[PDB]
Structure 1
Amino acid sequence: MSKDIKQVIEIAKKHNLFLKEETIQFNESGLDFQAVFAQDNNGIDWVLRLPRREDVMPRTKVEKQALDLVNKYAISFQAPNWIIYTEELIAYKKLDGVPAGTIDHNIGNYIWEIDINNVPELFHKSLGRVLAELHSIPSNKAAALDLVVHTPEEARMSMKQRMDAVRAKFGVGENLWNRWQAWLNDDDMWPKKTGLIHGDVHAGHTMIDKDANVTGLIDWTEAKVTDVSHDFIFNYRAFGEEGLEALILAYKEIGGYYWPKMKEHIIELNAAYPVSIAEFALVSGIEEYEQMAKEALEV
C-alpha cells in the first residue's frame, strides 16, 4: 500500500503529474484498471486509471473516440478529457460535482444524493438538454470512427439478433419472448433516427451540482451511434413513469428527436433489460449475474 501509493506517485511523476501523497485514494475497481483519485500540486483533483491489462490502446480506442467527439462539440456538460493517455497511465481532471447516486452492489440499491421521493425537476430539465446536445453531435463528420454505427433498421436488427442469442443460451419465458417479438414487429414504435449515445447513463455516471443539474457525464465505454432510447432507461427504472415523462418532455422541447411512440418504445426496451443482464453474465462469468439473468428471463 505504501508500495502502491509510492507506485502511483512514480507513474504519475513519469507523466509529469505531481500528486499530493496524502490525497491519494484507491477506489472500487474491476479487472481492467485500478481507479484512483488524487490531487495535484496546484490543488486540482484528478482521476487516474492504472492499467491492469495489456493492449490499452486497442481496448480504449472506442471510448477515446467518443470522448474526442464530446470534447470537440459539447458545451452544456463536461466529459473526461484524457490529458494523460499512454499505455502506462490514463488520467483526467475530475469533473465538477458528485454522482446523483452510487450503487451499493450488496443490497442492490442506490445510495442517493438527491431526494428519491421528491426528485428535483432540474435533474430532468438538465439531463434533457445534455442528452439532446449529445445525441445531435455530428459523428458522421469524423474521417475514421470505430464506434458501432447503426441506421434505425440496423438498431432494430441488432436487438432482434441479441434476443435470439440470449434465447439460444439461456431460454426465455414464453410470455416475455412474445412481448419482445411484438415490440420488434411493431414498425411504428421504432425510432426513425439514431444518434451518438453515452450507453451507460445512470445516477453513478451523471455528475450533478448542488441544485441537481447534470453538469457532467463519466464512463463512456458504451458509447456508439444507435437508438437514443438507451439513455432514457435509467430515468424510468429509478424514477418511474413520471421521471421518464419529464425527461422525454425536456428532451423534446429543447429539440431532441421525438416520435409519437417514444415513451412506449422506451418502456418496451426496458422490458428487454434481461438481454443486457444475460450478456453481462456471459462475458463476465460472475455467477450472481447468471442468476439475475435467469430470474429476469422468466425461465
Structure 2
Amino acid sequence: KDIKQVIEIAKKHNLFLKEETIQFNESGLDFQAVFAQDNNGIDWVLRLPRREDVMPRTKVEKQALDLVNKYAISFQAPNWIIYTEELIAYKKLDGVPAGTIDHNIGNYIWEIDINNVPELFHKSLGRVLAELHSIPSNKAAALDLVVHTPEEARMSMKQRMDAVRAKFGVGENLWNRWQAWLNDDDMWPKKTGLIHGDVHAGHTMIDKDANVTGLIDWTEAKVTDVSHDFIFNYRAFGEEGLEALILAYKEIGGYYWPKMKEHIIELNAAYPVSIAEFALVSGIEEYEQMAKEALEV
C-alpha cells in the first residue's frame, strides 16, 4: 500500500526504483523519509510531504543547499534533483552517520567509540566547518536566510532569552550566568558565517576512517555565530573533544578568537533557550517538561 504509493509518486517524477529495496524510516511530522535504489543501483533518499506549503517552507533550506553544492569541495550535502510540492529526492550521500538515534533506548547507536574518538574525526570536522563557515553567501543574488552581523547575533541571543523568560521564567542563577555572558564584550566573536545549525552525530556522515565527508538536514542553516556548530562536539565528547575541534578549525584558517572555547561553553549553557522555543512551536508535551527542567524553574 505505502510501497505502491512510493512507486507511483516516484514514477510521476521520472524516478524508477527497485521495489525490493524500498525502506521506510520512522516518524514524520513534516516529511516521511524513504530509502530506495534506482534501477542502476544508485541509492536515493525520498522525502514524502505530510504538510501543506512545501515549497515556501523549504525555500530558505534549498538556498542553503544551493550554496553548499556550489562552493563546498570537502564535504557533500543533499542535492535535491527532484524538488516539487509532491516529492523531494536526492542521491544518498557517501558514508554513514557517526551515530543514529534509536528511540527505543533514548540514545545513539554509535559508529565510533565516544570514549576513544579517532583524531581524524575532529580534524576532518574542523576542516569541514572551516570550509562551510567561509562560504561567501553574499555572492548570491537572493538570500532569505536569517543573516546576522556579529552585533546582531549577540542582540538576537539577548532578545531570545528575554522572550523565553517572559513565557517560562528562568532560574535566577541561570539567568545571571546568561546575562554575564551577554555582557562580556571580549567573549563575543567579531565574524559570523553560514552555519549548518544542527550538527550532531545523526547528521554527520563519516567514511571508514571516521573522516567527515558530508552533512545532512540543513533546515536550521543561517548566517550567524559559528559557535553553534561546535556545541554537539562539546556535549558528546566533553572539553577534550571541543578543544580538538577548535584546534583543527583554527589551524586550517577558520575564524578564531581567544575566548572561543569559553564562549562556546556559555552558548551550551544557553541551550535551554532553544529547547524552550522548540517546546513552544511544536506543542509536544515531552519537550515542554524538558524545557522547564532545563530552564531551572
Shift of 1:54: 1.3
8 A Cα contact 2:17 2:37, kept in partner: yes
Equivalent residue, structure 2, for 1:52: 50
Equivalent residue, structure 2, for 1:92: 90
Counterpart-to-counterpart distance in 2, 1:22 and 1:259: 52
1:80 to 74, 78, 81: 78
Number of matched residues? 297
8 A Cα contact 2:28 2:50, kept in partner: no
Q: Evaluate the alpha carbon distance shift between residue 104 and residue 34 of structure 1 in structure 2; reply closer, same or farther with a 3 A threshold.
A: same
Shift of 1:107: 4.0
Counterpart-to-counterpart distance in 1, 2:53 and 2:246: 39
1:63-95 CA-to-partner distances (Å, cap 9, x unmatched) read 100000000000000000000011111000000
Gaps of 5+ in 2: none
The farther-off stretch of 102-111 and 82-91 is: 102-111
The farther-off stretch of 63-72 and 24-33 is: 24-33
8 A Cα contact 2:18 2:36, kept in partner: yes
Q: CA RMSD in A?
A: 0.7
1:233 to 228, 231, 234: 231
Equivalent residue, structure 1, for 2:153: 155
Shift of 1:105: 3.4
Equivalent residue, structure 2, for 1:189: 187
Shift of 1:28: 1.6
Shift of 1:109: 1.7
Equivalent residue, structure 1, for 2:15: 17
Shift of 1:111: 1.5
Alignment of structure 1 residues 127-206 onto 2, 5 Å: 127-206=125-204
Q: Normalization by structure 1: what TM-score?
A: 0.98
1:190-237 CA-to-partner distances (Å, cap 9, x unmatched) read 000000000000000000011101100000000000000000000000
SS at match of 1:204: helix
Shift of 1:110: 1.7
| Structure 1 residue ranges (4+ consecutive) displaced by more than 4 angstroms after TM superposition | none
Shift of 1:15: 0.8
SS at match of 1:49: strand
Counterpart-to-counterpart distance in 1, 2:231 and 2:179: 19
Counterpart-to-counterpart distance in 1, 2:18 and 2:291: 43
Gaps of 5+ in 1: none
Counterpart-to-counterpart distance in 2, 1:142 and 1:88: 27
Shift of 1:169: 0.8
The farther-off stretch of 122-131 and 106-115 is: 106-115
Shift of 1:106: 4.8
Counterpart-to-counterpart distance in 2, 1:193 and 1:77: 22
SS at match of 2:194: strand
Counterpart-to-counterpart distance in 2, 1:220 and 1:169: 28
The farther-off stretch of 57-66 and 23-32 is: 23-32
* Overall identity of the aligned pairs, in %: 100
Counterpart-to-counterpart distance in 2, 1:134 and 1:54: 31
Counterpart-to-counterpart distance in 1, 2:73 and 2:152: 30
Counterpart-to-counterpart distance in 2, 1:19 and 1:108: 33
Shift of 1:47: 0.2
Shift of 1:30: 2.1
Counterpart-to-counterpart distance in 1, 2:105 and 2:165: 28
SS at match of 1:63: helix
Counterpart-to-counterpart distance in 1, 2:159 and 2:90: 37
Equivalent residue, structure 2, for 1:255: 253
1:82-133 CA-to-partner distances (Å, cap 9, x unmatched) read 0001111100000011110112335432211101111001000000000000
